[PDB]
Each structure stands twice: as structure tokens, then as C-alpha cells.
Amino acid sequence: IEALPTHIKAQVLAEALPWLKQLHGKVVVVKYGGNAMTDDTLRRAFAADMAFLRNCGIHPVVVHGGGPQITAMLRRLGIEGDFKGGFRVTTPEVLDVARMVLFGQVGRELVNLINAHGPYAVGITGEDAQLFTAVRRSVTVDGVATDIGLVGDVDQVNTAAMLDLVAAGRIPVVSTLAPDADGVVHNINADTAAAAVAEALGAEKLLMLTDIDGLYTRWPDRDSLVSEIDTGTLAQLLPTLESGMVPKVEACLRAVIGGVPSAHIIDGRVTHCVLVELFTDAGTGTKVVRG
Template sequence: MKPLGTVKPTSHVAVVGDLFPVEQLELERLRGKVVVIKFGGHAMVSQELKQSFARDVVTLRRAGLLPVVVHGGGPQISAMLERLDLAVHFEAGLRVTTPEVMDVVRMVLTGRVQRELVGLINAHGPFAVGMSGEDAHTMTAVRRAAWVNGEPVDIGLVGEVVDVNAETVRALLEQDRVPVISPVARGTGGEVYNINADLAAAAMAVALDAEKLVMLTDVEGLYANWPHSTEVIRRATAEEIEKLLPELASGMLPKMEGCLRAVRAGVRSAHILDGRVPNSALRGIVSGDAPGTTVIPDQEARVG
């Protein structure tokens, strides 16, 4: 990866002056580093939480970090499908995507959700630029199946990212922009695929040599013994997460799969955070003891 351009932070002390000293130190350490944030869950349907997230993103950029946002849009897609009287169906946590559903996915993600998020961020500073995985061949995908009870199930135009050409994203970062990316990708034959936003964010984090991958969701983190307990696993190695994958609920599975892929491919840490809490993105990124669940590489745990 070629080095990114010179970072031009503003006075981050004034911007985030209410942080604890350890958080200020982490903010300094992260200056010039890429952090990929997957924005989704309840935070996407609450106006207050969307505003909070937009402020967090601008705060991070003004402090000298290089945030990249990959957004979902599941609730908005489902709402539009219901309005159009099209079936809403999932297998293993993945949306079954017919050609008709794919048209709605593209329309909602890039035409509505992305535009709103770009506008919210730019209300606090002229940083955000919207794009999708289709643009400039940024993401290339192949068709994937869902696995149910050990058997593959056809789920239509749902893709698995097999290649990321991140040059356009890097160019935007060099221009002091915040890329806001919709998880839609092209196949090698020109077909368009719906990509799980968690896995798209993980692939982007790997391609950008990101320092951190952060996923905002609707729970406090990865529960140790769901549904019998709400105790959250605060820290886990990639090996520990891999052992848990077969037991995870469908909604948490792609998130932890994405975290696992990211840290095993060089991302220093991955975090599952509760997006229902205001400023969770900011606090989770700069906290030395981030709330939620943190996934680290196996070798880091051995060194520690």
C-alpha cells in the first residue's frame, strides 16, 4: 500500500476535550491511521443516533484519523420491499435477493441511505463522499450460497467479495475526504451483487491496512451464552472466535466472521459495539478498553 497523504488535523483537543487522558493518548496514536466503521442496526433508524454518528465521524477526521464508513440498510430495504409488495426472506442471516429485490437494494442503499448519511456528515464538515463497491471496480464479488443445517441454499444475487481495488478510496483519503461506501459489488461477468455490509467492511479494512475495524450493531457485544445469559465477551482471540462461529445466531454470524477475517489478514483489532449508545463509535475507537467485544489476532495474545 502506498503511503497516504499528509494528514491535516484541526485542534482535536478542542474537538474532543472531554475525553479521558488514556483516550487522548489513543487518539494521538491513531493519527494518520485508517479506521473502517460499519454503520448499521438501530443507529440507522434513529435520527438522534444518526446525528451522533455523523458528529463522531467528523470529530475523528478533524483529529487526524482516516475514517472510512461502510453502511448497511437492512431495515430501509425491508420497508421498501414491503411497500412494493415484494417478499422479504432471509437464510442464515443473508437476504434472499432476486433480480427485482436487487433493484430495490441498489436504489435504497445508494440512492437513499448513502445520500442521507453523506448529508449528515457534511453538515458538520465538508468531508463525506458517497460511492458504492461498483464504482471504479472497487469491489469484485462472486455469487455465494447460504449454509443451512450443513447444506448450501441458493439465495440469489448475494455475493462474496473476492477482490478489493482500494485505489479510489485511498485517493479520497489523500484528499481529506471520508468515503461512505454502499455494499454493492460487480461480478466478473457484469452482474450486480448484494453484499453483507459486515463482510464488505471487513474486506475494505483488510485492503486499506486499517488499524481498526468497528461494527455498530443492536446489542452490547457478543454474548457468552445467549439466550441464557447477557454476559458479554469483552475480549477474544481469532482462534476463540473461530471455535464459536458454528454456535452463533444468524445476525451475529457475519459480524464475527468479518472480525475474524480482518484480524487474520492484518487488521490490528476488530470491535463489535452497541450502536444504540450515542457516541459509541468515537468512544469505541479511542478507548483503551473499548465497550462491547474486541477481537485480536492470536499472536498478539501470545505476546501479551
């Protein structure tokens, strides 16, 4: 990167200015998962980018999942799964493992990576200071809503206390578990939780890291890939798309309809994808606006 002239280095930095002004002093919620968390180089770049935002006076909030790591831990403990549809039932035993893995392993890695740059990261669940609650959720198998145990959706969010946390200079790293109204802790889909937190905090942007170039309207036609779409056109395309793209689109719909100015599905396989998406126009990924 040294054989590149200094006056092009300048222009690249200068073209970040409009996006620095747009985001200065604002909340950005970043759903972190997939490859951007398994490969060590992408991991470290992601942590650097959270430090970047913080050292620009931007307020990042990280929401993470960890489905596969839960599965691996359950197999290691020899805990036999019950499955309704393609859903593991979340017994009290499974919840304990999920919470232990998400908060006690997956979140800790990200906190330590970010904290390599300063005392920024703080790990939290809805349990801590009652920062958010859950409501138990059923799923539809074939065409019947069924109980798959202690799994929920985000209910209420302590918006004031969360924004106190970021105004102090902290980067919350959220593991998505929270008590219901009776104190019973549920596991929440990280994609959904990210949308709910962005709406509650009044985020300026929601970023969704996934392992795709962007949204394809007619996958796999290479030139069905769009770079911007309104929630109006996006919702009528939802019943079309691949199984795994559904939760990331529903999150973008709910956030942007909820008042978040834009949500973005970006390529987690790209190093520093957050920097590219936020401070560059030539980014991959697709932006969702209301319409």
C-alpha cells in the same frame, strides 16, 4: 455537563492522547447499522463522530447496510418475494430495489448528516470507478448450497484508488453493491464487506456497530460477557452464538486474521459509541485480536 469540574474535563481529554497517536494518519473502517442508524439522535452523533475522526487526521471509512429498508420498499412496490430457507432470492428486480434503496436513500442520509460538518462524505459502490468487485455466493439451507440470486461476497478491492480517496480528505460512505467479473451487479452483506474493506485497506481498526453490550460467551449469563478475545478462542465459540451475532463475529475473525490489528464489536445504542470505543478505556464492547 456544566456542573462537572474543569479539571476532570481536562483529564478525560488528556486520556485520549495514546489513542490519538495510535490512529493519527490511519484508516478506520466502521460498519454502521442497527439502532445507531434508525434513531435520529444516535444518527447525528455517529455523523459528528466521523467528522471528529476526520478533524483529528484519522481516515474513517463507513460501510452501511439497510436490510429492513429494502424489505419495506419491496412491500411498498408489491414485489412478491421468493424464499429459500429464510433467504429472500435476489432476482434482477430485487437487486435494482436494493441498490436504489441502499445507494439512493440510506447512503444519502448518512452523506448529508456527515456533510453538515464539512465537505467530507462521498457516497460510493463497487460500481464507481470499479472500486471493488463481487463474486456470486451461494448459501447452505439445511445442508445444501443453494442459489439465492444476485448476492455475493467482495472479491477484489482497488486499494490504491480507495486510499487516494481518503488521503484527499474524503470520508467514503459505502453502499455494498458491486459488479461481478461480467459486469453483473450483486448485493453484498454489509458486515462481510466491512471486514473485506478493512483488510484490503490495511485498516488499523474495524468497528462493528450492533445493538448489544458486547459478546456473551454463554448468553444469556450476564457475566459471560468478555471485553477482549483472541481469534483462536473466538472461532471455536462461533457455532455457539445467536444467529444475528454470527455475521458480526465472522467479520471480526476474517479482518483480524487478515492482518487488521484489532476489530471491535461495540454498542450502537450508546450515543457517541465510536468516540467512547476509540478514545476511552471504559468503553463497552469487545476487542478481537489475533491469537
